[PDB]
């Protein structure tokens, strides 16, 4: 029952700010060394803040690569780990993981969280734009092939995908994001079911949840 | 600072195998006075947050199959799978959380081998409600392959190709260690319009004939 949950992040101007949050629970946060780790794009994980025991004083450590602009902080009454991400540059942008720094004979984190994306760019956000995936019962061959064409938008940080079917037979397919022409993202997600877990006039919807924003769905016709 | 030095940096099975990645530190990383070191080893599946492996340089976290072990002391650390399996596909890092700042190493990613698999492939046509907007885009899916090199052409009508076409692969299946990729060929309603005859045809080892999935339609 030792779980943390991190929030907040997305897309964020350079010079912007943020404030992650890290919501722990089911253990005593007020005596255990709290962790903020990142990791880019294509890179390895990186460690940047450190918060500390209510034992030697809720001291801090910062890499060096954060020195200065990122401020951790706790709100004790509330068991939250916070993250103050004051001017933001592109170099930022990574998935913030909090973690527990256990120590018993050792240290090593026990606990890591889902993570939480923050892309600092100049463009904007743009929703996806859910197009069904769909073939004319002359192309069905059984298997059926259904999908959703999740199109044109910004940024791309975290998509989540899932199909109100699920079972044996059910196969689903999430394909990364593709930088298409107008420098916005593009995916595609089918799912694969028997014939007769999708016969006709039926349907399945797919949802989207895409960074922090609320959920999209589509009704995709077998 | 303390380096973290792991490697190889990629690792190919065939499964069943044994493996061993190794992670040197640029410092000792062993207490003086505890002896213990202060390495942990971290597995990192495809889009999932790392999770414990080892702890101490060789214990092995409460539910981790017994497949995994760790050795070392001092500098030069390792890592061993006795029987590589379809779900170890991962990335595994090594980390100093001996002093301040942490550091980790690039990491090592376990890539199965498997007998060659014939890709299923798949056309969509643009939707309807997506062509009153001004595009079109034909999705055409590749799913479980082997190897990953996988050429996709789009001959849009008599004979094409071009920079209107987007590639992704997806990563290795966790049960197959099999691909899938999709190939989308986005132009616009007028364009898609003129011609007809769409097709998508893949270029596979497995097979000698370009393997063709096809349409033909866009008056209607
Ligand atoms: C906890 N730690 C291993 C990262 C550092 C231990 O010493 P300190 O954290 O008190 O400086």
Redesign the interface.
């Given at each position: 029952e030792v779980k943390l949950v991190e929030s907040g992040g997305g897309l964020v101007q350079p010079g912007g700010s943020l404030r992650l949050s890290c919501a722990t629970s089911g253990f005593t946060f007020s005596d255990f060394y709290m962790?903020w780790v990142r990791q880019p794009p294509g890179k390895?994980?990186?460690?940047i803040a450190?918060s500390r025991n209510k034992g030697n004083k809720y001291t801090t450590?910062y890499?060096?690569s954060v020195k200065g602009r990122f401020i951790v902080s706790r709100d004790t009454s509330q068991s939250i780990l916070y993250l103050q991400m004051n001017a933001l540059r592109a170099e930022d942008t990574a998935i913030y993981?909090c973690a527990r720094?256990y120590y018993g004979?050792?240290?090593?984190?026990?606990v890591?969280?889902?993570?939480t994306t923050v892309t600092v760019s100049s463009e904007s956000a743009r929703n996806p734009?859910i197009?069904?995936?769909?073939?004319?019962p002359a192309?069905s061959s059984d298997p059926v092939?259904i999908?959703c064409?999740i199109?044109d938008y910004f940024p791309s940080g975290t998509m989540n995908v899932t199909w109100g079917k699920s079972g044996k037979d059910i196969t689903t397919?999430?394909?990364?994001?593709?930088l298409?022409?107008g420098g916005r993202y593009?995916?595609?997600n089918?799912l694969?079911l028997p014939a007769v877990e999708c016969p006709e006039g039926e349907s399945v919807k797919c949802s989207v949840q895409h960074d922090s924003n609320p959920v999209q769905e589509l009704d995709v016709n077998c | 600072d303390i380096v973290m030095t792991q490697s190889p940096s990629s690792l190919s099975v065939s499964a069943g195998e044994r493996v061993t990645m190794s992670c040197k530190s640029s410092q000792s990383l062993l207490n003086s006075g505890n002896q213990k070191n202060f390495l942990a080893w971290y597995q990192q599946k495809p889009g999932q947050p790392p999770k414990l492996l080892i702890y101490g340089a060789s214990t092995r976290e409460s539910g981790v199959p017994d497949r995994f072990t760790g050795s070392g002391s001092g500098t030069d650390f390792t890592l061993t799978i006795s029987s590589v399996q379809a779900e170890d596909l991962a990335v595994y890092y090594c980390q100093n959380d001996h002093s301040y700042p942490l550091t980790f190493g690039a990491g090592t990613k376990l890539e199965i081998k498997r007998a060659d698999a014939a890709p299923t492939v798949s056309i969509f046509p643009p939707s309807s409600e997506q062509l009153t907007s001004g595009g079109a885009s034909v999705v055409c899916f590749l799913n479980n392959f082997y190897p990953k090199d996988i050429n996709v052409k789009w001959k849009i009508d008599g004979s094409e190709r071009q920079n209107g076409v987007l590639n992704s692969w997806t990563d290795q299946d966790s049960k197959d260690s099999t691909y899938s990729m999709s190939s989308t060929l986005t132009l616009t309603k007028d364009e898609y319009e003129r011609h007809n005859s769409y097709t998508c045809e893949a270029t596979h080892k497995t097979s000698t004939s370009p393997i063709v999935k096809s349409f033909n339609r866009n008056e209607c």
């Open positions: 962790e390895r994980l990186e460690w450190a450590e890499s060096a993981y720094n004979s050792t240290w090593y984190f026990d890591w969280g889902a993570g734009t197009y069904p995936l769909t073939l004319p192309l092939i999908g064409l199109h397919v999430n394909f990364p994001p593709a298409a022409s593009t995916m595609s089918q694969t | -």
